[PDB]
């Protein structure tokens, strides 16, 4: 959920609620356990609030309307500062990066995807070293992605 | 640390001032991470005005920000 129907899909002043309220009501009952989710929930604070979709949602929070969001910690901070309300509905769930060894475990799970994606074999030691490499040389990136970048980049390198 | 302090540590930008990255380094870390341990490196050279305002956390473990929000993470550990 969001950005497309909630923003691109708007020409009129009530378009923050048209379609949006519609779908909120469409999903309240009968049609299995519908859960919407927001990948870029930062928008849902509103630019100056003004109920830019953001208030109608929590306004209806007494039931159903199950939604999971996602924000970075600083975006969280910003939507909190810029709203004060969605936070009463939303549970803050902290996500920590994995250790290097744990990162390798995901790399292993992902390894065959990459071998397939690029048509190349990958060594287990590739994954192991990618993760420790990243810890050492990529301070501005988190391990999951950093290690994967080393893998997917290397694979792409070879693919070319 | 200089007398500007605010953002680089615990207070953050007074809301309404440009820079909405506020207390990123310390307060927001506690905001995000209920509590942890903090280490105050060479407090002798910290700006005096700052040493003074950090007292709000040293005892009466309050953490009021420029965001207008308060963390109060008295559950943390501080080492100076």
């Amino acid at each position: 959920l969001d950005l497309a129907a909630l923003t691109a899909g708007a020409k009129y002043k009530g378009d923050f609620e048209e379609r949006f309220k519609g779908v909120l009501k469409e999903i309240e009952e009968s049609k299995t356990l519908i859960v919407l989710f927001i990948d870029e929930i930062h928008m849902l604070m509103g630019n100056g609030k003004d109920d830019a979709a953001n208030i109608l949602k929590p306004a209806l929070s007494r039931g159903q309307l199950k939604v999971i969001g996602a924000t970075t910690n600083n975006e969280y901070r910003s939507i909190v500062e810029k709203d004060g309300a969605f936070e009463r509905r939303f549970q803050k769930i902290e996500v920590a990066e994995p250790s290097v060894r744990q990162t390798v475990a995901i790399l292993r799970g992902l390894q065959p995807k990459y071998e397939i994606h690029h048509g190349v074999r990958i060594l287990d030691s590739a994954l192991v070293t990618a993760a420790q490499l990243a810890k050492r040389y990529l301070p501005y990136r988190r391990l999951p992605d950093s290690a994967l970048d080393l893998v997917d980049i290397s694979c792409a390198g070879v693919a070319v | 640390l200089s007398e500007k302090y605010a953002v680089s540590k615990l207070l953050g930008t007074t809301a309404g001032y440009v820079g909405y990255d506020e207390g990123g380094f310390l307060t927001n870390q506690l905001q995000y991470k209920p509590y942890s341990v903090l280490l105050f490196d060479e407090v002798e050279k910290a700006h005096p005005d700052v040493l003074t305002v950090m007292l709000q956390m040293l005892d009466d473990g309050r953490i009021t920000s420029g965001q207008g929000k308060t963390i109060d993470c008295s559950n943390c550990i501080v080492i100076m």
Partner: peptide
């Protein structure tokens, strides 16, 4: 599983609020 004052509140709260100080673990 009668909701437990201690173990349930502490554990579920800890998963969301951290608070390891409230765990009272057997690994003390």
């Amino acid at each position: 599983q009668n909701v437990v004052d201690s173990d349930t509140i502490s554990e579920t709260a800890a998963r969301l609020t951290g608070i390891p100080v409230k765990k009272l673990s057997e690994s003390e």
